[PDB]
Design a protein around this ligand. Structure first.
Ligand SMILES: Cn1c(=O)c2c(ncn2C)n(C)c1=O
Ligand SMILES: [Zn+2]
Length: 312
């Protein structure tokens, strides 16, 4: 017999005596050793003392799992392991001071999401995610990428959407106190103010221009006229403005960073544009600098703190 540790978080370890005549799966359920699936394997003597991950299959492990990952989805950990086997083999070059990802397995959407996160102010609430995120910021991003895939219910190689991805991640970020107040004005129906909080206060779908959002965008009214919607008040460290991809000119110094999307739902590619002393296009491991940029932009990120309209 051998003594080992089992765990769901590699924080709380639990002693186990292992029967060498049974596989790990027969004793523990699906079981991983340093990420390798050992479910169908007989214990080796050399495994004595090692730490194994298992699926949360009792109350203690379930609570520990929830406390570390902030999800009760029982398939989460298996999904994470499957992703991590791949993301450990990706490469994470430093590009223009940021951790990027060299292209692999259609991962451009994860690269531009990671590049974006390093330019906006945000903290993740699940300890697993915030821990992985700080390692990713330093260049060791495999765990962070596998968690993102797991949180988004995506597998390695699946095409992804940055906006959807950002939405899921923001739901695990402390945006609780972010606030947006909007006003919609119809000459017939009058004015209707709305207040949004959390993730809905920092994401908008329909226009890339933050300035246009402040000035007012035309939206239809059920009465049949065109109403105007504009931003009354914003309280957040950034905003995300998105729209269906379309040719768009990005101007140095008017935005923080942006996502460009080429292709369709069957085959496509993201690039990342950032505004520094000039414009930089980060494309996985590739870097290109230019003073102007035009492309099929789909998300633009802007810094914010507090904004109040002067529209009376
Ligand atoms: C996979 N892939 C694409 O699919 C792609 C692209 N540029 C345009 N497209 C569509 N690049 C650079 C790419 O690596
Ligand atoms: Zn109306």
């Amino acid at each position: 017999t051998i003594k080992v540790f089992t765990t769901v978080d590699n924080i709380n370890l639990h002693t186990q005596v292992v029967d060498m005549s049974m596989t790990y799966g027969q004793q523990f359920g699906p079981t991983y050793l340093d990420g390798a699936d050992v479910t169908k394997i007989k214990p080796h003597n050399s495994h004595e003392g090692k730490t194994f991950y298992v699926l949360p299959n009792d109350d203690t492990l379930r609570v520990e799992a929830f406390e570390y990952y902030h999800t009760t989805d029982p398939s989460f950990l298996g999904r994470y392991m499957s992703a991590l086997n791949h993301t450990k083999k990706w490469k994470y070059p430093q590009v223009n001071g940021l951790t990027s990802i060299k292209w692999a397995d259609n991962n451009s959407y994860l690269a531009t999401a990671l590049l974006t996160l390093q330019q906006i102010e945000l903290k993740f609430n699940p300890p697993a995610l915030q821990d992985a995120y700080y390692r990713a910021r330093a260049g060791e991003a495999a765990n962070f990428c596998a968690l993102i895939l797991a949180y988004c219910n995506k597998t390695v190689g699946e095409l992804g959407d940055v906006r959807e991805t950002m939405s899921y991640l923001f739901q695990h970020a402390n945006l609780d106190s972010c606030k947006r107040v909007l006003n919609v004005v119809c000459k017939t129906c009058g004015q209707q103010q709305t207040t949004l909080k959390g993730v809905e206060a920092v994401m908008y779908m329909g226009t890339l221009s933050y300035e246009q959002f402040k000035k007012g965008v035309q939206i239809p009214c059920t009465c049949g006229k065109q109403a105007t919607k504009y931003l009354v008040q914003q309280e957040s460290p950034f905003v995300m403005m998105s729209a269906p991809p379309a040719q768009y000119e990005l101007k140095h110094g008017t935005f923080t960073c942006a996502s460009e999307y080429t292709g369709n739902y069957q085959c496509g590619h993201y690039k990342h544009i950032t505004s520094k002393e000039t414009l930089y296009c980060i494309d996985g491991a590739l870097l290109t600098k230019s003073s102007e940029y035009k492309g099929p932009i789909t998300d633009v990120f802007y810094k914010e703190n507090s904004y109040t309209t002067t529209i009376k």
